[PDB]
Design a protein around this nucleic acid. Structure first.
Ligand SMILES: CN[C@@H]1[C@H](O)[C@H](NC)[C@H]2O[C@@]3(O)C(=O)C[C@@H](C)O[C@H]3O[C@@H]2[C@H]1O
Lengths: 5, 153, 240
RNA sequence: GGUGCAUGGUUGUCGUCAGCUCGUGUCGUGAGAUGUUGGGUUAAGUCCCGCAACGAGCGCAACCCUUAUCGUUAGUUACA
RNA sequence: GGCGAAGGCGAAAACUUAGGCCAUUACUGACGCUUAGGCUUGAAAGUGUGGGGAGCAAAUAGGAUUAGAUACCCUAGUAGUCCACACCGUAAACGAUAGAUACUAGCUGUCGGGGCGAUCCCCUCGGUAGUGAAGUUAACACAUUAAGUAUCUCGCCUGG
RNA sequence: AUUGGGCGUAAAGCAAGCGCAGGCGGAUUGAAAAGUCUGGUGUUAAAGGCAGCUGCUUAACAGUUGUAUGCAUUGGAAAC
């Protein structure tokens, strides 16, 4: 998935 | 959070003009609630080896799941030619295991399970095989998502 | 949507029949042109996906480190991109252990600070040997720990020119949980990279274009100007 | 008086030989390896380039003293 | 490098014969695998019958060597090494891997069959080698010719 | 080691081959059902294993209530 927080 | 010893051994490398004697320690770490791991260490004396083993085992920590306080499906784990056979224990029967396996299963927060060992027993190899077999565990949601049916059967 | 196909003209040219059959879905019939030739539609889709992911990561202060270790072209490329955008960079490839733990990075940054703020007052006072040792230590720190001086936490992202010749860091990243974005033509293990970029780096122009595209992708996060994202021009420059 | 194959202390030898192991991390189910490896440079893991290694301690060098250049102090019982 | 099931097979030719490979557009109708018991072949040394016996040479003798040397060194000299007939059936008769059945990423050489064609390269089926991912084995190592994947049969295995 | 082991280097693949018998086997359809699956019936004694109950002060015990593989006949099923 994206948006590595 | 328990950090009980498993098997401490004397080891030594041979070198020109003397051989270096040292202690090798195998440890297993478990919160009794899901975080488990194991490690090895060697050092000249007890404290350094113990600290090294604790750090190594803490670094390799990984979680484990609980199915009704049991291992709901059979598992035959292998590593280094040492078979471990684990099968569910019905609650109300108690937990049976041998020393190293006893510590492994109690440290993982497992209520009861029926265990058997095939092949020549060896501590480190047996621990590796048992952890590989336990981390191989399946789950009803896994089979549900990989199947068309969304029920256990 | 980005970097129209009229600018990609020399995107192929990899080595002859020395690859890994782990790839193949990204490759047209190999024995038809004796070279590793890629499909460009999937190329553009992968480039767009990589751009989207890198902009999402950098939007929340996602810092990235370049991987530039090859002989001549990528050295100047990484120098230009690092001196353009305020991000850490690697000059010579890792020797192992410089990315798996922070304590070594901490002692390295402490050594850098002490060295610079002490050599600020020691350049000709004693013999040439100690001053030359100070300069050599500065240069060694540039060689290995040059770019790692602005981070307080472990790098959240890293861009690699090829998994080959840089196997140590990518293996650690497999051991670690950090996401990986990297360039790879066919000589890779696609399992070790989570954001595949089937862009061939054999031709310098394509590598330059993609590096500038990624620099502009990370540029928008810190509110700094972009140069080559939608520009209707391909970077053409004879090999140095 | 005896037991330096029961000892402390001190001494010889390899030998002023340069190697010895350490922490971290990686690899391998393991003893273990990785540094210390390869290439140049010196008597020297003195030093550096590359390498799944980074540092760190020990001995080695530098950290003392003299000889040969000079400044600078006093000139005696040298000096005259 | 090739050939045959293995041992093994290399002067030239004459005779007979063995099996193999490829396209099958041809035929019969599953007639296929393995194989207890039996049968056939089965290096080299030797035994028996008889020839031939240039060299080579265990035992045997001498000379050097060694403290001693019944050995390595050298010179001698039969069995034997050759062949015709009938025997022996031993081995590291090793890929130390029983055969068969299909199936499971690649890469680089060699040769045989087919087509295209100055050679060369090309593709297709194969023998044959090396390199090399999954996977396997305790490790070494193995890797489409498996010690992988599973099956059928025979033989073999139970501390020294 | 049917459950539940192996045969490259640790014991173990015969020196190789031809093969009698045996064991194992390409696809489709039919028939019965040789085993198998599945009912009924009669037979697997008593005592004994196992479960409940009862009287022994009470457990030990004894008695009782049931249960237990297998066999043959008989009807269904025709996937192997
Ligand atoms: C012949 N010189 C050797 C050589 O330098 C050896 N190292 C390679 C060295 O090894 C030592 O330093 C040691 O570590 C132990 C001792 C037995 O010998 C010591 O002295 C040893 C020296 O005597």
């Amino acid at each position: 998935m994206g948006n590595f927080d | 959070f328990e950090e009980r010893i498993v098997k401490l051994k004397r080891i030594s490398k041979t070198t020109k003009g003397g051989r270096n004697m040292r202690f090798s320690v195998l440890v297993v770490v478990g919160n009794r609630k899901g975080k488990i791991g194991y490690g090895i260490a060697k050092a000249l004396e007890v404290p350094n080896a113990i600290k090294k083993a604790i750090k190594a085992a803490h670094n390799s920590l990984h979680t484990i799941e609980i199915h009704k306080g049991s291992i709901y499906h059979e598992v035959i784990g292998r590593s280094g030619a040492s078979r471990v056979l684990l099968k569910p224990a019905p609650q109300g029967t108690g937990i049976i295991a041998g020393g190293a396996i006893r510590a492994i299963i109690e440290l993982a927060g497992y209520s009861d399970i029926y265990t058997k060992n095939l092949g020549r027993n060896t501590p480190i190899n047996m621990i590796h095989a048992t952890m590989d077999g336990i981390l191989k565990q399946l789950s009803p949601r896994r089979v549900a998502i990989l199947r068309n049916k969304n029920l256990n059967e | 949507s980005l970097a129209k196909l009229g600018e990609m003209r020399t995107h192929v040219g990899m080595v002859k029949r020395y690859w890994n059959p782990k790839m193949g879905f990204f490759i047209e019939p190999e024995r038809k042109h004796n070279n590793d030739h890629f499909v460009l539609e999937l190329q553009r889709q992968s480039l767009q996906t990589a751009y989207n992911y890198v902009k999402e990561v950098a939007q929340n202060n996602g810092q990235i480190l370049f991987v530039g270790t090859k002989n001549d072209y990528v050295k100047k490329l990484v120098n230009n991109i690092a001196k353009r955008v305020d991000v850490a960079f690697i000059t010579q490839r890792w020797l192992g252990g410089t990315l798996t733990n922070f304590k070594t990075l901490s002692i390295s940054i402490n050594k850098l600070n002490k060295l610079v703020e002490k050599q600020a007052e020691n350049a000709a006072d004693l013999t040439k040997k100690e001053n030359l040792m100070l300069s050599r230590e500065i240069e060694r720190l540039e060689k290995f720990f040059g770019g790692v001086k602005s981070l307080k936490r472990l790098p959240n992202l890293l861009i690699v020119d090829d998994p080959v010749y840089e196997k140590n860091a990518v293996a650690e990243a497999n051991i670690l949980r950090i996401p990986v974005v990297a360039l790879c033509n066919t000589n890779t293990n696609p399992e070790l990279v989570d954001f595949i970029i089937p862009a061939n780096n054999h031709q310098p122009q394509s590598t330059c274009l993609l590096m500038n595209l990624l620099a502009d992708a990370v540029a928008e996060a810190k509110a700094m100007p972009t140069m080559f994202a939608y520009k209707p021009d391909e970077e053409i420059q004879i090999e140095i």
